[PDB]
Amino acid sequence: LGGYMLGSAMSRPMMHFGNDWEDRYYRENMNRYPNQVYYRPVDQYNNQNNFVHDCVNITIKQHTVTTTTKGENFTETDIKIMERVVEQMCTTQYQKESQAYYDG
Ligand SMILES: Cc1ncc(C[n+]2csc(CCO)c2C)c(N)n1
């Protein structure tokens, strides 16, 4: 990996996009989609968006390869569900891990 760690699977978000075609594609493809996030530890960092870009990148990179060779074929629609919920989870894992990095 280089220095990345899986936070774990998303606790079934019930979140949103504002685009009903992406709402549906979440409920219709979540069985196939990459539902978990890999990050570098927050210790070298101070800000979510840049870290979170690397976090969505490493989980999408590994897990798209893992799921395509199981029988999948993601689209820009699946990427937009993935990128949203992974980015939300990456930023939420940053919040918890950054609180713990302040706590000890
Ligand atoms: C895991 C999960 N993610 C997204 C939605 C979809 N959804 C929630 S708000 C809204 C956007 C349109 O107002 C839609 C319909 C869901 N139900 N479950």
Q: What small molecules does the structure contain? A: the ligand Cc1ncc(C[n+]2csc(CCO)c2C)c(N)n1
- Shape assignment: globular
In helices, the fraction of residues equals 55-70%
Counted by DSSP, the helix tally is: 3
Oligomer: monomer
CATH topology: Major Prion Protein
Structure summary:
The PDB classes it as membrane protein. By secondary structure, the chain is mostly helical. The protein is built from 3 helices and 2 strands.
Describe this structure in words.
- The protein is mostly helical and 104 residues long.
- The protein has a single domain (1-104), classed as Prion/Doppel protein, beta-ribbon domain (Major Prion Protein), CATH 1.10.790.
- The protein has 3 helices and 2 strands; from the N terminus they run βαβαα.
- It has helices spanning 20-29, 48-68, 76-103, and strands at 5-9, 36-39.
- Strands 1-2 form a two-stranded antiparallel sheet.
- Helix 1 packs across helix 3 (76-103).
- It is globular.
- 21% of the residues are buried.
- Bound molecules: ligand VIB.
- The ligand Cc1ncc(C[n+]2csc(CCO)c2C)c(N)n1 is lined by residues 13-17, 20, 23, 26-27.
- Glycans are attached at residues 57, 73.
- This is Major prion protein.
- Disulfide bonds join 55-90.
- Residues 1-104 are annotated as: PrP27-30 (protease resistant core).
- It comes from Mesocricetus auratus.
- It is classed as membrane protein.
